């Protein structure tokens, strides 16, 4: 609040304007970064209420209805594990909307495959989507269909191991 200090600071010109403009550019760049990363879909997709995906379990990555934050258990664990003229501007996208964007992406990639990323969301059963992905890496569909239960069990075990590894490693 010293007026003499500001009077002496006026001799240096527009340094303060340059610093404010650089910080403003950084601040809008952060919102642009979040917009480019998470807002890649303009349709907010939802999963069906019945979670019949041919034995595949997505409860650890789908949003939990019991939680007020509407986050997944993995996302809840991730948020728990991260801990004078100065102002902190809030981000343009709140954590709830970023969680909603990730939920929309998860619903799109579970219910519609990769079709929603290239156009309208075309529904497909998940054991058929997995077979298409198996054909993408050069494995025949029959291998996926015959061993669908084993692959579903391995996928669920791997997701549980991911949650355990995140919870057990600082």
């Amino acid at each position: 609040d010293s007026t003499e200090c500001s009077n002496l600071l006026l001799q240096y010109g527009s340094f303060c304007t340059q610093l404010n403009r650089a910080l403003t550019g950084i601040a809008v760049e952060q919102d642009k970064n979040t917009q480019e990363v998470f807002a890649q879909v303009k349709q907010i997709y939802k999963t069906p209420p019945i979670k019949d995906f041919g034995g595949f379990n997505f409860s650890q990555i789908l949003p939990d209805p019991s939680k007020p934050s509407k986050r997944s258990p993995i996302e809840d664990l991730l948020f728990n594990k991260v801990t004078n003229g100065l102002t902190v501007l809030p981000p343009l996208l709140t954590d709830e909307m970023i969680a909603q964007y990730t939920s929309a992406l998860l619903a799109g990639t579970i219910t519609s495959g990769w079709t929603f990323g290239a156009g309208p969301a075309l529904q497909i059963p998940f054991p058929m989507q997995m077979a298409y992905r198996f054909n993408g890496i050069g494995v025949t569909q029959n291998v996926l269909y015959e061993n669908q239960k084993l692959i579903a069990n391995q996928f669920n075990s791997a997701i549980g191991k991911i949650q355990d590894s995140l919870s057990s490693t600082p």
Binding site: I44, G54, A104, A107, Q123, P125
Partner: protein, 50 residues
């Protein structure tokens, strides 16, 4: 207002139904990327002192 993220779409998922496209659109989109700037050179002695 509180901004809407997108239009709400509920995918009609079931374990035995698929959606197959019957038509297509040839879509052309623009992408603008900067390549270079103006090449500026400053004579340091002339700028400071003339």
């Amino acid at each position: 207002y509180t901004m809407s993220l997108g239009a709400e779409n509920s995918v009609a998922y079931s374990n035995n139904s698929i959606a197959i496209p019957t038509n297509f659109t040839i879509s052309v989109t623009t992408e603008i990327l900067p390549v270079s700037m103006t090449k500026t050179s400053v004579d340091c002695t002339m700028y400071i002192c003339g």
